[PDB]
A paper describes a structure:
Here, we show that [name] likely functions as the SBP for the ZrgBC permease/ATPase transporter system as it is required for normal growth and survival in zinc-deficient conditions in the ΔznuA background.
Six protein molecules occupy the asymmetric unit, although the protein is purified exclusively as a monomer as determined by size exclusion chromatography. The N-terminal residues from Asp 22, the first after the predicted signal sequence cleavage site, to Gly 39 could not be modeled into any chain due to a lack of electron density. The same is true of residues 113–123 comprising the first part of the flexible loop, except for chain D where only residues 116–120 are missing. These regions are also absent in the apo PA4063 structure, indicating a high degree of flexibility and disorder. A disulfide bond is present between Cys 100 and Cys 195 in [name] that is conserved in PA4063 and other homologues. The beta-sandwich structures are virtually superimposable, although the long alpha helix is angled away from the central beta sheet by a few degrees in [name] relative to PA4063. The crystal structure of apo Δ124-184 [name] was nearly identical to PA4063, including the observation of unstructured regions at the N-terminus and His-rich loop.
Residue numbers in the entry: 39 to 111, 123, 185 to 242
Amino acid sequence: QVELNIAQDGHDLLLEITAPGADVVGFEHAPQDDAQKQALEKALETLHHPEKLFALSDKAQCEKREVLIKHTLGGSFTAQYQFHCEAVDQLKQIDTQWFQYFPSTEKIQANVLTEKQQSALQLNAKQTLIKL
């Protein structure tokens, strides 16, 4: 149900993650109080920082090009990140911190496409590694 898609095509790396609102902020309704409003703002703030969620090796020299965040109010969040990496061969793996910022997420269904090489894996808070 949290779904992460990763596609690497030359220097272009696309990461896209779709998550129900309960997986992101803890609730799917409109904030009821200041705590919930701050939780939503903090969550949206983190989603605009893909480098906190999906650390790319500095040796890959990945530049952020586009960030798209959609919130549909069940409610869900989609974050779509586009990087251009100068040294994409230096991108060996990603260690996601998704669960550190969004501990309500139990598991991620991940799909990885590196050129034409397709693989899937299920991540959890203790198994956050993705091979690229």
